Coordinates of C-alpha atoms (C1' of nucleotides) and ligand atoms in Angstrom, one line a residue:
Chain A
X1 CA -17.8 -35.8 -52.0
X2 CA -15.3 -37.0 -54.9
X3 CA -13.2 -38.9 -52.2
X4 CA -13.8 -41.4 -49.3
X5 CA -13.5 -41.1 -45.7
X6 CA -11.2 -43.5 -43.9
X7 CA -12.7 -45.3 -40.9
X8 CA -11.2 -42.9 -38.1
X9 CA -12.8 -40.0 -40.1
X10 CA -16.0 -41.4 -40.1
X11 CA -15.6 -42.2 -36.6
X12 CA -14.7 -38.5 -35.5
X13 CA -17.7 -37.2 -37.8
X14 CA -20.5 -39.6 -36.7
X15 CA -19.1 -40.0 -33.1
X16 CA -19.2 -43.7 -33.4
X17 CA -16.3 -45.9 -32.4
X18 CA -14.0 -47.5 -35.1
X19 CA -14.7 -50.8 -33.3
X20 CA -18.6 -50.2 -33.9
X21 CA -18.1 -49.4 -37.5
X22 CA -16.0 -52.5 -37.9
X23 CA -18.6 -54.5 -36.2
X24 CA -21.5 -52.8 -37.8
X25 CA -19.6 -54.0 -41.0
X26 CA -19.5 -57.6 -39.9
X27 CA -23.2 -57.9 -39.3
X28 CA -24.1 -55.9 -42.5
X29 CA -26.0 -53.1 -40.7
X30 CA -23.6 -50.4 -42.1
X31 CA -20.8 -51.1 -44.7
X32 CA -18.2 -49.1 -46.2
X33 CA -18.9 -48.2 -49.7
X34 CA -15.5 -49.3 -50.8
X35 CA -12.8 -51.9 -49.5
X36 CA -9.4 -51.6 -50.9
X37 CA -8.8 -54.9 -52.2
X38 CA -5.1 -54.8 -50.8
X39 CA -5.0 -53.2 -47.6
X40 CA -8.5 -54.2 -46.4
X41 CA -9.0 -50.6 -45.5
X42 CA -12.6 -49.4 -45.1
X43 CA -13.7 -46.4 -47.1
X44 CA -16.9 -44.4 -46.8
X45 CA -19.0 -41.8 -48.9
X46 CA -20.4 -38.7 -47.5
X47 CA -24.1 -39.7 -48.9
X48 CA -23.9 -42.8 -46.9
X49 CA -23.3 -41.0 -43.4
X50 CA -27.0 -40.5 -43.2
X51 CA -27.8 -44.3 -42.6
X52 CA -26.0 -43.7 -39.4
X53 CA -28.7 -41.3 -38.0
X54 CA -31.1 -44.2 -37.7
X55 CA -28.7 -46.5 -36.4
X56 CA -27.6 -44.2 -33.6
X57 CA -31.1 -43.2 -32.7
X58 CA -32.2 -46.7 -32.6
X59 CA -29.2 -47.7 -30.4
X60 CA -30.1 -44.9 -28.4
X61 CA -33.6 -46.3 -27.3
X62 CA -31.9 -49.7 -27.2
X63 CA -33.2 -51.3 -30.3
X64 CA -31.3 -54.6 -30.7
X65 CA -28.6 -54.4 -34.0
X66 CA -30.5 -57.2 -35.7
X67 CA -33.9 -55.4 -35.5
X68 CA -32.4 -52.2 -36.9
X69 CA -31.6 -54.3 -40.1
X70 CA -35.5 -54.9 -40.4
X71 CA -36.1 -51.2 -39.3
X72 CA -33.9 -49.6 -42.3
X73 CA -36.3 -51.1 -44.7
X74 CA -39.2 -49.0 -43.8
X75 CA -41.1 -46.3 -45.6
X76 CA -42.2 -43.6 -43.3
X77 CA -45.9 -45.0 -42.4
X78 CA -44.5 -48.4 -41.2
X79 CA -41.7 -46.6 -39.4
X80 CA -44.1 -44.5 -37.7
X81 CA -45.6 -47.6 -36.6
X82 CA -42.6 -49.2 -35.6
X83 CA -42.1 -46.1 -33.3
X84 CA -45.4 -46.7 -31.5
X85 CA -44.0 -50.1 -30.8
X86 CA -41.1 -48.5 -29.1
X87 CA -43.3 -46.3 -27.3
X88 CA -45.5 -48.9 -25.7
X89 CA -42.5 -51.0 -24.7
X90 CA -41.2 -48.0 -23.0
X91 CA -44.4 -47.4 -21.2
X92 CA -44.2 -51.1 -19.8
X93 CA -40.5 -50.3 -18.6
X94 CA -41.9 -47.3 -17.1
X95 CA -44.7 -49.0 -15.2
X96 CA -42.3 -51.6 -14.2
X97 CA -39.9 -49.2 -12.7
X98 CA -42.5 -46.8 -10.8
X99 CA -43.7 -50.1 -9.2
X100 CA -40.4 -51.0 -8.2
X101 CA -39.7 -47.6 -6.7
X102 CA -42.8 -47.9 -4.6
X103 CA -41.8 -51.4 -3.5
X104 CA -38.4 -50.7 -2.3
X105 CA -39.7 -47.5 -0.7
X106 CA -42.0 -49.8 1.3
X107 CA -39.4 -52.6 2.1
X108 CA -37.2 -49.5 3.5
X109 CA -40.1 -48.3 5.7
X110 CA -40.4 -51.8 7.1
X111 CA -36.9 -52.0 7.7
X112 CA -36.7 -48.7 9.5
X113 CA -39.4 -49.7 12.1
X114 CA -37.2 -52.9 12.9
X115 CA -34.2 -50.6 13.9
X116 CA -36.2 -48.0 15.7
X117 CA -37.4 -51.1 18.1
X118 CA -37.8 -49.3 21.5
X119 CA -35.7 -51.9 23.2
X120 CA -35.6 -55.7 22.8
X121 CA -36.6 -58.3 25.3
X122 CA -38.9 -55.9 27.1
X123 CA -42.9 -55.7 26.2
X124 CA -44.0 -52.7 24.4
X125 CA -47.7 -51.4 23.9
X126 CA -47.9 -49.7 20.5
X127 CA -50.3 -48.5 17.8
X128 CA -49.8 -50.3 14.5
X129 CA -51.0 -50.0 11.0
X130 CA -52.5 -52.8 8.9
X131 CA -50.2 -55.1 7.3
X132 CA -51.7 -57.0 4.3
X133 CA -50.6 -60.5 4.2
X134 CA -51.4 -64.0 2.3
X135 CA -51.8 -67.0 4.6
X136 CA -52.4 -70.6 4.6
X137 CA -53.7 -73.0 7.2
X138 CA -50.7 -74.4 9.3
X139 CA -51.6 -78.3 8.9
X140 CA -50.5 -79.0 12.5
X141 CA -47.1 -77.4 12.3
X142 CA -45.6 -75.5 15.0
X143 CA -42.3 -73.8 16.6
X144 CA -40.3 -77.0 16.7
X145 CA -41.0 -78.5 13.1
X146 CA -41.6 -75.6 10.7
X147 CA -39.6 -75.3 7.7
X148 CA -38.5 -72.7 5.0
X149 CA -40.2 -75.0 2.6
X150 CA -43.5 -74.7 4.4
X151 CA -43.4 -71.1 2.9
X152 CA -42.6 -72.1 -0.6
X153 CA -45.9 -72.0 -2.0
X154 CA -47.0 -68.6 -0.4
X155 CA -43.7 -67.2 -1.5
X156 CA -44.5 -68.3 -5.3
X157 CA -47.7 -66.1 -5.0
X158 CA -46.0 -63.4 -3.6
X159 CA -43.1 -63.2 -5.9
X160 CA -45.4 -63.4 -9.2
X161 CA -47.2 -60.1 -8.1
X162 CA -44.6 -58.3 -6.0
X163 CA -41.2 -59.4 -7.6
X164 CA -39.5 -58.7 -4.3
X165 CA -39.3 -62.2 -2.3
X166 CA -37.2 -61.4 0.7
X167 CA -39.5 -60.6 3.8
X168 CA -40.3 -62.0 6.9
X169 CA -41.8 -65.1 7.8
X170 CA -45.1 -65.1 9.7
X171 CA -47.2 -67.4 11.8
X172 CA -50.1 -67.1 14.1
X173 CA -51.4 -68.9 17.2
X174 CA -54.0 -68.9 20.0
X175 CA -53.1 -67.0 23.1
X176 CA -53.3 -69.5 25.7
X177 CA -51.2 -69.8 29.2
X178 CA -48.9 -72.3 27.7
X179 CA -46.5 -74.1 30.0
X180 CA -44.0 -75.5 27.3
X181 CA -43.2 -75.5 23.5
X182 CA -44.5 -78.7 22.5
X183 CA -47.9 -77.7 23.9
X184 CA -48.1 -75.1 21.1
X185 CA -49.2 -75.3 17.4
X186 CA -49.8 -72.5 14.9
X187 CA -52.9 -71.9 13.5
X188 CA -51.9 -70.3 10.2
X189 CA -48.7 -69.5 8.7
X190 CA -48.3 -66.4 6.6
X191 CA -46.3 -63.8 4.7
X192 CA -46.6 -60.1 4.0
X193 CA -47.9 -58.6 0.7
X194 CA -46.1 -55.5 -0.7
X195 CA -47.9 -54.8 -3.6
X196 CA -51.4 -54.1 -4.6
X197 CA -51.2 -55.8 -7.8
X198 CA -53.8 -58.7 -8.4
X199 CA -52.5 -62.0 -7.7
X200 CA -52.8 -64.3 -10.6
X201 CA -55.2 -67.1 -10.0
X202 CA -54.7 -67.5 -6.4
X203 CA -56.1 -70.9 -5.3
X204 CA -58.6 -71.4 -2.6
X205 CA -56.3 -72.6 0.1
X206 CA -54.5 -69.2 0.3
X207 CA -56.3 -66.5 2.1
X208 CA -55.7 -62.8 1.4
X209 CA -56.1 -61.1 4.8
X210 CA -54.5 -58.6 7.1
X211 CA -53.0 -58.0 10.6
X212 CA -55.5 -55.1 11.4
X213 CA -54.8 -51.4 12.5
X214 CA -54.8 -51.6 16.4
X215 CA -53.0 -51.6 19.6
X216 CA -50.8 -54.1 20.1
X217 CA -48.7 -55.7 23.1
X218 CA -45.2 -56.4 21.4
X219 CA -41.9 -58.0 22.2
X220 CA -39.1 -58.2 19.9
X221 CA -35.7 -59.9 20.3
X222 CA -32.8 -61.5 18.5
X223 CA -33.4 -65.1 18.4
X224 CA -32.3 -67.8 20.7
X225 CA -33.9 -71.3 21.3
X226 CA -33.7 -70.5 25.0
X227 CA -35.4 -67.0 24.6
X228 CA -38.1 -68.1 22.4
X229 CA -40.4 -69.4 25.0
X230 CA -39.5 -67.2 28.0
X231 CA -40.1 -64.2 26.2
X232 CA -43.6 -65.4 25.3
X233 CA -44.1 -65.9 28.9
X234 CA -43.2 -62.1 29.6
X235 CA -46.0 -61.3 27.2
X236 CA -48.4 -63.6 28.8
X237 CA -47.3 -62.3 32.1
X238 CA -47.5 -58.5 30.9
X239 CA -51.2 -59.0 30.0
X240 CA -52.2 -60.9 32.9
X241 CA -50.7 -58.2 35.3
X242 CA -52.4 -55.2 33.6
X243 CA -55.8 -57.5 33.0
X244 CA -55.7 -56.7 29.4
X245 CA -58.0 -58.1 27.0
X246 CA -56.7 -59.7 24.0
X247 CA -58.6 -59.5 20.7
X248 CA -56.4 -61.7 18.0
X249 CA -53.9 -64.4 17.9
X250 CA -50.4 -64.1 18.9
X251 CA -48.7 -62.9 15.7
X252 CA -45.1 -64.0 15.4
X253 CA -42.6 -62.7 12.7
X254 CA -39.2 -63.8 12.0
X255 CA -36.7 -61.7 9.9
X256 CA -33.2 -62.6 9.0
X257 CA -30.7 -59.7 10.5
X258 CA -28.3 -60.7 7.6
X259 CA -28.1 -63.0 4.5
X260 CA -24.6 -64.0 4.6
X261 CA -23.4 -67.7 4.0
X262 CA -20.2 -66.6 5.8
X263 CA -21.5 -65.4 9.1
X264 CA -23.4 -67.2 11.8
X265 CA -27.2 -67.0 11.1
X266 CA -29.3 -64.6 13.0
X267 CA -32.8 -63.7 13.3
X268 CA -35.2 -60.9 14.7
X269 CA -38.2 -62.4 16.5
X270 CA -41.3 -60.2 16.9
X271 CA -44.4 -61.6 18.7
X272 CA -47.5 -59.3 18.9
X273 CA -51.0 -59.6 20.1
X274 CA -53.7 -57.2 19.9
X275 CA -55.6 -55.8 22.9
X276 CA -58.8 -53.6 23.2
Chain B
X1 CA -34.5 -80.8 8.6
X2 CA -32.5 -83.9 9.2
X3 CA -31.5 -84.8 5.3
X4 CA -31.0 -82.6 2.2
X5 CA -32.7 -81.3 -0.7
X6 CA -31.3 -82.4 -3.9
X7 CA -30.8 -79.7 -6.6
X8 CA -34.3 -80.3 -8.3
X9 CA -36.2 -80.1 -4.9
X10 CA -34.5 -76.7 -4.4
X11 CA -35.3 -75.5 -7.6
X12 CA -39.1 -76.4 -7.5
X13 CA -39.0 -74.9 -3.9
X14 CA -37.4 -71.5 -4.7
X15 CA -38.5 -71.3 -8.3
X16 CA -34.9 -71.0 -9.4
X17 CA -33.6 -72.9 -12.2
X18 CA -31.1 -75.8 -11.7
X19 CA -28.8 -74.2 -14.1
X20 CA -28.9 -71.2 -12.1
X21 CA -28.2 -72.8 -8.8
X22 CA -25.3 -74.5 -10.5
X23 CA -24.2 -71.1 -11.6
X24 CA -24.7 -69.5 -8.4
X25 CA -22.6 -72.4 -7.2
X26 CA -19.7 -71.5 -9.6
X27 CA -19.4 -68.1 -8.5
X28 CA -19.7 -68.7 -5.0
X29 CA -23.0 -66.6 -4.4
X30 CA -24.8 -69.7 -3.2
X31 CA -23.3 -73.0 -2.6
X32 CA -25.0 -76.2 -1.7
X33 CA -24.0 -77.2 2.2
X34 CA -22.8 -80.3 0.9
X35 CA -21.4 -82.1 -2.2
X36 CA -21.2 -85.9 -2.5
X37 CA -17.4 -86.7 -2.9
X38 CA -18.4 -89.4 -5.4
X39 CA -21.6 -88.4 -7.5
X40 CA -20.7 -84.5 -7.3
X41 CA -24.4 -84.2 -6.4
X42 CA -25.5 -81.0 -5.0
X43 CA -27.1 -81.2 -1.7
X44 CA -28.9 -78.0 0.3
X45 CA -30.2 -77.7 3.9
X46 CA -33.6 -75.9 4.7
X47 CA -31.8 -73.3 6.8
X48 CA -29.8 -72.2 3.8
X49 CA -33.0 -71.7 1.6
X50 CA -33.4 -68.2 3.1
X51 CA -30.2 -67.1 1.6
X52 CA -32.0 -67.3 -1.6
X53 CA -34.3 -64.4 -0.9
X54 CA -31.8 -61.7 -0.9
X55 CA -30.4 -63.1 -4.3
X56 CA -34.0 -63.3 -5.9
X57 CA -35.2 -59.9 -4.8
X58 CA -31.8 -58.3 -5.9
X59 CA -32.0 -60.3 -9.2
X60 CA -35.4 -58.8 -9.5
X61 CA -34.1 -55.2 -9.5
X62 CA -31.2 -56.1 -11.7
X63 CA -28.2 -56.0 -9.2
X64 CA -25.5 -57.8 -11.1
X65 CA -24.5 -61.0 -9.2
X66 CA -21.0 -59.9 -8.2
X67 CA -22.5 -57.1 -6.3
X68 CA -24.8 -59.3 -4.6
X69 CA -22.0 -60.9 -2.9
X70 CA -20.9 -57.6 -1.3
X71 CA -24.7 -57.1 -0.7
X72 CA -25.0 -60.5 1.6
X73 CA -22.3 -59.1 4.1
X74 CA -24.5 -56.1 5.2
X75 CA -26.1 -55.9 8.6
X76 CA -29.5 -54.0 8.2
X77 CA -28.3 -50.3 8.4
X78 CA -25.6 -50.7 5.9
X79 CA -28.4 -52.7 3.6
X80 CA -31.0 -49.9 4.1
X81 CA -28.1 -47.6 2.5
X82 CA -27.8 -50.2 -0.2
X83 CA -31.2 -49.9 -1.0
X84 CA -31.4 -46.0 -1.3
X85 CA -28.6 -46.5 -3.8
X86 CA -30.8 -48.7 -5.7
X87 CA -33.6 -46.3 -5.5
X88 CA -31.6 -43.3 -6.9
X89 CA -30.4 -45.5 -9.7
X90 CA -34.1 -46.5 -10.4
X91 CA -34.9 -42.7 -10.4
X92 CA -32.4 -42.1 -13.1
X93 CA -33.8 -44.8 -15.1
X94 CA -37.0 -43.2 -14.7
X95 CA -36.0 -39.8 -15.8
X96 CA -34.0 -41.2 -18.8
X97 CA -37.2 -43.0 -20.1
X98 CA -39.7 -40.5 -19.5
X99 CA -37.6 -38.0 -21.4
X100 CA -37.5 -40.7 -24.1
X101 CA -41.2 -41.3 -24.1
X102 CA -41.5 -37.4 -24.8
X103 CA -38.9 -37.4 -27.5
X104 CA -40.2 -40.2 -29.4
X105 CA -43.6 -38.8 -29.2
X106 CA -42.4 -35.4 -30.7
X107 CA -40.1 -37.3 -33.5
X108 CA -43.7 -38.9 -34.3
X109 CA -45.7 -35.5 -34.4
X110 CA -43.2 -34.6 -37.0
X111 CA -43.7 -37.5 -39.2
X112 CA -47.4 -37.2 -39.2
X113 CA -46.9 -33.7 -40.6
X114 CA -44.7 -34.9 -43.4
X115 CA -47.2 -37.4 -44.4
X116 CA -50.2 -35.1 -44.2
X117 CA -48.6 -32.9 -46.7
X118 CA -51.6 -31.2 -48.8
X119 CA -49.6 -32.1 -52.0
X120 CA -46.3 -32.0 -53.4
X121 CA -44.9 -29.6 -56.0
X122 CA -47.8 -27.2 -55.6
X123 CA -47.4 -23.9 -53.1
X124 CA -49.3 -23.7 -49.9
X125 CA -49.8 -21.1 -47.5
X126 CA -49.9 -22.6 -44.0
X127 CA -49.9 -21.5 -40.2
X128 CA -46.9 -23.3 -38.4
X129 CA -45.7 -23.7 -34.9
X130 CA -42.3 -22.7 -33.7
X131 CA -39.4 -25.0 -34.2
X132 CA -36.3 -24.5 -32.0
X133 CA -33.2 -25.0 -33.9
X134 CA -29.2 -25.0 -33.6
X135 CA -27.6 -23.3 -36.3
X136 CA -24.1 -22.3 -37.4
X137 CA -22.8 -19.6 -40.1
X138 CA -22.6 -21.5 -43.3
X139 CA -19.1 -20.3 -44.4
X140 CA -19.7 -19.7 -48.2
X141 CA -21.4 -23.1 -48.7
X142 CA -24.5 -23.6 -50.9
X143 CA -26.6 -26.4 -52.6
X144 CA -24.1 -27.4 -55.0
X145 CA -21.4 -28.2 -52.3
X146 CA -22.8 -28.8 -48.8
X147 CA -21.9 -32.1 -47.1
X148 CA -23.4 -34.2 -44.4
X149 CA -20.1 -33.5 -42.7
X150 CA -20.9 -30.0 -42.7
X151 CA -23.6 -30.8 -40.1
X152 CA -21.2 -33.1 -38.1
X153 CA -20.7 -30.5 -35.2
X154 CA -24.1 -29.5 -34.8
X155 CA -25.2 -33.2 -34.7
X156 CA -22.6 -33.7 -31.9
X157 CA -24.4 -30.9 -29.8
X158 CA -27.9 -32.3 -30.5
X159 CA -27.0 -35.9 -29.8
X160 CA -25.3 -35.1 -26.3
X161 CA -28.7 -33.5 -25.4
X162 CA -31.5 -35.0 -27.2
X163 CA -30.0 -38.5 -27.7
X164 CA -32.0 -38.9 -30.9
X165 CA -29.8 -38.0 -33.8
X166 CA -32.0 -38.7 -36.8
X167 CA -33.9 -35.8 -38.1
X168 CA -33.8 -33.4 -41.0
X169 CA -30.9 -31.3 -42.1
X170 CA -31.7 -27.5 -42.5
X171 CA -30.3 -24.5 -44.3
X172 CA -31.4 -20.8 -44.8
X173 CA -30.7 -18.3 -47.6
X174 CA -31.9 -15.0 -48.9
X175 CA -35.1 -14.6 -50.9
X176 CA -33.7 -13.0 -54.2
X177 CA -35.0 -13.4 -57.8
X178 CA -32.2 -16.2 -58.5
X179 CA -31.8 -17.0 -62.2
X180 CA -29.8 -20.3 -61.5
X181 CA -28.3 -22.2 -58.7
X182 CA -24.9 -21.3 -58.5
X183 CA -26.1 -18.0 -58.0
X184 CA -27.1 -19.0 -54.5
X185 CA -25.5 -19.4 -51.1
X186 CA -26.7 -20.5 -48.0
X187 CA -26.7 -18.1 -45.0
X188 CA -26.8 -20.5 -41.9
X189 CA -27.1 -24.1 -41.8
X190 CA -29.1 -25.7 -39.1
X191 CA -30.8 -28.6 -37.4
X192 CA -33.8 -28.8 -35.3
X193 CA -33.7 -29.4 -31.6
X194 CA -36.1 -31.8 -29.8
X195 CA -35.5 -31.6 -26.1
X196 CA -35.3 -28.8 -23.8
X197 CA -32.3 -30.0 -21.7
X198 CA -29.5 -27.5 -21.4
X199 CA -26.8 -28.3 -24.2
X200 CA -23.4 -28.9 -22.4
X201 CA -21.0 -25.9 -22.9
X202 CA -22.1 -25.1 -26.3
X203 CA -19.8 -22.7 -28.1
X204 CA -20.1 -19.3 -29.5
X205 CA -20.1 -20.5 -33.2
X206 CA -23.5 -22.3 -32.4
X207 CA -26.6 -20.3 -32.3
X208 CA -29.8 -21.5 -30.4
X209 CA -32.5 -20.0 -32.0
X210 CA -36.0 -20.7 -33.7
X211 CA -38.1 -20.7 -37.1
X212 CA -40.7 -18.7 -35.6
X213 CA -44.4 -19.0 -35.1
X214 CA -46.1 -17.4 -38.6
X215 CA -47.9 -18.0 -41.9
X216 CA -45.8 -19.3 -44.2
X217 CA -45.5 -20.0 -48.2
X218 CA -44.4 -23.6 -48.4
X219 CA -43.7 -26.1 -51.2
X220 CA -42.6 -29.7 -50.5
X221 CA -41.5 -32.4 -53.0
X222 CA -39.5 -35.5 -53.3
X223 CA -36.1 -34.5 -54.5
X224 CA -34.5 -34.4 -57.9
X225 CA -31.7 -32.4 -59.0
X226 CA -33.9 -31.0 -62.0
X227 CA -36.8 -30.0 -59.6
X228 CA -34.8 -28.4 -56.9
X229 CA -34.6 -25.1 -58.7
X230 CA -37.6 -25.1 -60.6
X231 CA -39.5 -25.4 -57.5
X232 CA -37.9 -22.5 -55.7
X233 CA -39.1 -20.7 -59.1
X234 CA -42.7 -21.5 -58.3
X235 CA -42.5 -20.3 -54.7
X236 CA -40.9 -16.8 -56.1
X237 CA -43.5 -16.8 -58.8
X238 CA -46.2 -17.5 -56.2
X239 CA -45.1 -14.7 -54.0
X240 CA -44.8 -12.1 -56.8
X241 CA -48.3 -12.8 -58.3
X242 CA -49.9 -12.3 -55.1
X243 CA -47.6 -9.6 -54.1
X244 CA -47.0 -11.0 -50.8
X245 CA -44.6 -9.5 -48.4
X246 CA -41.9 -11.9 -47.1
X247 CA -40.4 -11.7 -43.7
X248 CA -37.7 -14.2 -43.4
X249 CA -35.0 -16.1 -45.3
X250 CA -36.0 -19.0 -47.2
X251 CA -35.9 -22.1 -44.9
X252 CA -35.0 -25.4 -46.7
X253 CA -35.3 -28.8 -44.9
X254 CA -34.3 -32.1 -46.2
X255 CA -35.2 -35.3 -44.7
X256 CA -34.5 -39.0 -45.8
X257 CA -37.7 -40.9 -46.9
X258 CA -36.0 -44.1 -45.9
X259 CA -32.5 -45.2 -44.4
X260 CA -31.9 -48.3 -46.5
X261 CA -28.5 -49.1 -48.1
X262 CA -30.4 -51.7 -50.2
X263 CA -32.7 -49.1 -52.0
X264 CA -32.0 -46.0 -53.9
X265 CA -31.8 -43.0 -51.6
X266 CA -34.6 -40.4 -51.4
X267 CA -35.3 -37.2 -49.8
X268 CA -38.2 -35.2 -48.8
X269 CA -37.5 -31.3 -49.5
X270 CA -39.4 -28.5 -48.0
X271 CA -38.8 -24.8 -48.7
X272 CA -40.7 -22.3 -46.8
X273 CA -40.6 -18.6 -46.2
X274 CA -42.5 -16.3 -43.7
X275 CA -44.9 -13.8 -45.2
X276 CA -46.9 -11.1 -43.2
Chain C
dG1 C1' 4.5 -41.2 -36.5
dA2 C1' -0.2 -42.0 -37.2
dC3 C1' -3.4 -45.0 -38.8
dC4 C1' -5.7 -49.0 -39.9
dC5 C1' -5.9 -53.9 -40.4
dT6 C1' -7.1 -59.1 -38.7
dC7 C1' -7.3 -62.3 -35.0
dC8 C1' -7.9 -63.7 -30.3
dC9 C1' -9.3 -63.0 -25.5
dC10 C1' -13.0 -60.7 -22.2
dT11 C1' -17.6 -59.7 -19.4
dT12 C1' -23.2 -61.0 -18.3
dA13 C1' -26.2 -64.8 -16.6
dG14 C1' -27.2 -68.5 -17.8
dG15 C1' -30.1 -71.9 -21.7
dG16 C1' -29.8 -76.1 -24.8
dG17 C1' -27.9 -79.8 -25.8
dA18 C1' -24.8 -84.5 -25.8
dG19 C1' -23.5 -88.1 -23.4
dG20 C1' -22.3 -90.2 -19.4
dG21 C1' -23.5 -92.1 -14.4
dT22 C1' -26.9 -92.4 -10.8
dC23 C1' -31.7 -92.4 -7.8
Chain D
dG1 C1' -37.6 -94.0 -15.6
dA2 C1' -36.3 -89.7 -13.6
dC3 C1' -32.7 -87.2 -11.8
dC4 C1' -28.3 -85.3 -11.7
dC5 C1' -23.5 -84.8 -13.3
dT6 C1' -19.8 -82.3 -16.5
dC7 C1' -18.4 -80.2 -20.6
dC8 C1' -19.3 -77.5 -25.0
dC9 C1' -21.4 -74.3 -27.7
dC10 C1' -24.5 -70.2 -28.1
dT11 C1' -26.2 -64.9 -27.8
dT12 C1' -25.2 -59.3 -27.1
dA13 C1' -22.2 -55.3 -28.6
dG14 C1' -18.6 -54.4 -28.9
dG15 C1' -13.5 -52.7 -25.6
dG16 C1' -8.6 -53.9 -25.2
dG17 C1' -4.9 -55.6 -26.3
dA18 C1' -0.7 -57.8 -29.7
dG19 C1' 1.5 -57.9 -33.9
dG20 C1' 1.6 -57.0 -38.3
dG21 C1' 1.3 -53.5 -42.6
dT22 C1' 0.2 -49.0 -44.3
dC23 C1' -0.6 -43.5 -44.6
Ligands
LIG301 C1 -40.4 -69.9 13.9 C2 -39.5 -71.0 14.2 N1 -38.2 -71.0 13.5 C3 -37.1 -71.4 14.4 C4 -37.1 -71.9 15.9 C5 -38.0 -71.4 16.9 C6 -38.3 -72.2 18.2 C7 -37.5 -73.5 18.3 C8 -36.6 -73.8 17.3 C9 -36.4 -73.3 16.2 C10 -35.8 -71.4 14.0 C11 -34.4 -71.8 14.5 C12 -33.1 -71.8 14.0 N2 -32.1 -72.0 14.6 C13 -33.2 -71.3 12.5 C14 -34.2 -71.0 11.9 C15 -35.5 -70.9 12.3 C16 -36.8 -70.7 11.6 C17 -36.7 -70.1 10.4 C18 -37.8 -69.8 9.8 C19 -39.0 -70.0 10.2 N3 -39.9 -69.6 9.4 C20 -39.1 -70.2 11.6 C21 -37.8 -70.7 12.3
LIG302 C1 -29.5 -29.5 -49.9 C2 -28.5 -30.1 -51.0 N1 -28.4 -31.5 -51.1 C3 -28.5 -32.2 -52.2 C4 -28.5 -31.4 -53.6 C5 -29.2 -30.3 -53.7 C6 -29.2 -29.6 -54.9 C7 -28.5 -30.0 -56.0 C8 -27.6 -31.0 -55.8 C9 -27.6 -31.8 -54.6 C10 -28.3 -33.8 -52.2 C11 -28.2 -34.4 -53.4 C12 -28.3 -35.9 -53.5 N2 -28.3 -36.5 -54.7 C13 -28.1 -36.6 -52.2 C14 -28.1 -35.8 -51.0 C15 -28.1 -34.5 -51.1 C16 -28.2 -33.7 -49.7 C17 -28.0 -34.3 -48.6 C18 -28.1 -33.7 -47.4 C19 -27.9 -32.4 -47.5 N3 -27.9 -31.6 -46.3 C20 -28.2 -31.6 -48.4 C21 -28.3 -32.4 -49.8

DNA sequence: GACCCTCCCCTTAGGGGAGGGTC
DNA sequence: GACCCTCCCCTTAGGGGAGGGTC
């Protein structure tokens, strides 16, 4: 009342660090009422402690410091408004994050499936859920000459909506009795969608579509140039032996086992085709 | 395939800035496959573009860069785990924020009431909702000698739970036919609670309680030392004239109209008492 | 002894230059 | 011409010292 608080006093009283008070002083957000012309010691009054309330609350909600300066100068009505601003900014952060919880949750579901592989290199028939995907005409591309860059445009579309880029790389081609790799060309290349958020101004050359719900003859394995083709062969054979009727392209997905530059790269390949 | 991408090429392809690639290089998160010993130009392969997926997704969810380095080295199972970590960290952020939406919403409701004052300086009788509060025995304090520092301990308790410090400052005293200020002493001083989150290890000397739901004889005004007492007088008179029966202490709240150091300080005073 | 002062260095993830040199 | 290089300065909100000087 009729004396001042030293810095340490204020700091214990308002639960704000000395360093912070000192800094709040440098920026002129909150200044000691008095500074001893000799010692440079900061001294504060009791009445001024109340200006800290605003500072602490705004800090708590994450208002930048230089905004608080603008905030101090408000009568209630205008400060009421100010708060609705903070509210809608918090709702955005909420929507953003809840979207994010759902996405990761899904990314996870997809990882689990690809570690619960029944076995590698043998053919399974399984019942699959729909997978939404964006795809593009693969303009004469195939296994021997497709690049990561081929996917770039698709990826830009996905990332803009989903946020989460990392995924598998897909392509499709016709089920034929192929007798070598060079014999084969992809129909479409594609990548899966994870969200249900409208894609911004998608352009004609992309197609939003799905790998439909159905029974599927599958084969999955860890990639090796040798095994690519010979595994497809198993799949062809499997189908011929059981006289199954195929009802879609061959769908091939490729997904990195890891993303380390320090280790040898390695991929999971999965090839599936729908049967009746 | 049999050549490299320059930096600008990669940047267009992965939608990552040159500055970022350059930086990701400085930290060894992602390094060009080749650097021209003469020009220092960075050159990248197609195969390596895939390491960016992880980088971009993790960046999207806000993993610090130095964590991504640890993240790259994971097989799927361990990376699955990693993701559940990210999930629970997102839930915390969600709980935090949703708490925050509710708090501000309330802070707002309270501001509206104190701008919908029916009029200042005249007495109203109104029906009030409960207000939860923490209070402490005011050890002989009163109007003439209470400080902001008096509230400090209460405030520490509130802030630890609510996050939001800024509020009104309350006190209570006995309804007597006072004939001067020095005649009066506060019973308890208090501050309102905003959350319903358990207060951490509150200590006996605090009381969690409320200003109960009821009818109340009120008077509110903008503070002036003169008007403090004379307004109380109106309230006493009001009650005597209508022979009302009082059923609680006088509750006094004080709230800053603004938090500017640059303007003259100014307070709203509200004095209310419960009647049957 | 305890408290306070200034000044200097640190962390994040780059963006915006300037002034080279290179495709 | 357009692209790329290095190096230097910038923003946030302080925390952790060191080496004074002061309660
Ligand atoms: C789908 C083709 N394909 C092959 C491949 C398949 C058969 C023969 C030769 C290469 C490949 C081979 C190596 N080593 C490394 C990466 C990839 C790859 C990477 C992405 C992608 N979308 C397709 C990819
Ligand atoms: C409730 C008392 N009171 C009075 C006051 C009331 C009557 C006579 C003299 C001072 C006050 C007067 C001025 N100028 C500035 C701040 C305050 C204040 C601030 C906080 C608080 N909790 C109580 C406060």
